[PDB]
Design a binder for this molecule. Structure first.
Ligand code: CL
Ligand code: CL
Ligand code: CL
Length: 211
């Protein structure tokens, strides 16, 4: 599965897709062979920074006080202050809304207990448990990475699908992004990309094109 094959798949996925009145995203899909997904160690749940980003930036919320909140404000992010944590635990409807509206959460490390007690019941099952940072952290670099980040998640099945860009990006960009995703698999298993059984590219409402 070389770059030429990937470009061909992206190109055809783009061409086959019917026009729709929204900007469609590119999705990359892979099945795995000869990997025992019954062993938890073989499962993948890994963030990947896409070199050209997602198409539209991921939305990030920050749970923090003091200078963490200041930084979040300076970066234009949703801020959830310490007082709001208990409130959101009460108002789970609102918490669901906030969870849906964001792709990643960053949290002041010392707030993790409070977050687990009150918000984790909603965030955890959605895979949006916050990632902790030290209270003195400069979060700008992390935020910039997360804006371009997608998650590869197989759960317990030899399959994943992941966002790799949108149609306003170039084919070359989509392929770079797909390569970044594949590198996770390459690094994960002893024989790496040997374990790719079949791979596909599609636009949101277009057909899946096999690589
Ligand atoms: Cl990465
Ligand atoms: Cl969600
Ligand atoms: Cl291109």
């Amino acid at each position: 599965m070389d770059r030429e094959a990937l470009l061909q798949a992206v190109k055809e996925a783009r061409e086959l897709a019917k026009p729709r009145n929204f900007t469609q995203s590119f999705e990359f899909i892979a099945t795995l062979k000869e990997i025992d997904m019954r062993k938890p160690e073989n499962r993948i749940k890994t963030e990947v920074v896409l070199p050209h980003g997602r198409g539209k930036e991921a939305k990030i919320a920050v749970i923090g006080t003091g200078d963490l909140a200041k930084q979040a404000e300076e970066l234009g992010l949703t801020v959830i202050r310490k007082e709001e944590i208990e409130e959101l635990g009460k108002n789970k409807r609102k918490l669901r809304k906030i969870a849906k509206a964001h792709d990643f959460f960053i949290a002041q490390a010392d707030l993790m207990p409070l977050i687990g007690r009150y918000m984790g019941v909603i965030l955890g099952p959605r895979g949006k448990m916050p990632k902790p940072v030290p209270a003195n952290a400069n979060i700008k670099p992390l935020v910039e990475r997360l804006k371009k980040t997608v998650v590869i998640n197989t759960r317990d099945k030899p399959y994943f699908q992941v966002l790799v860009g949108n149609e306003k990006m170039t084919d070359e960009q989509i392929v770079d992004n797909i390569e970044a995703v594949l590198n996770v698999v390459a690094k994960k298993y002893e024989k790496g990309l040997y374990h790719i059984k079949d791979a596909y590219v599609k636009l949101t409402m277009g057909p899946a094109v096999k690589v």
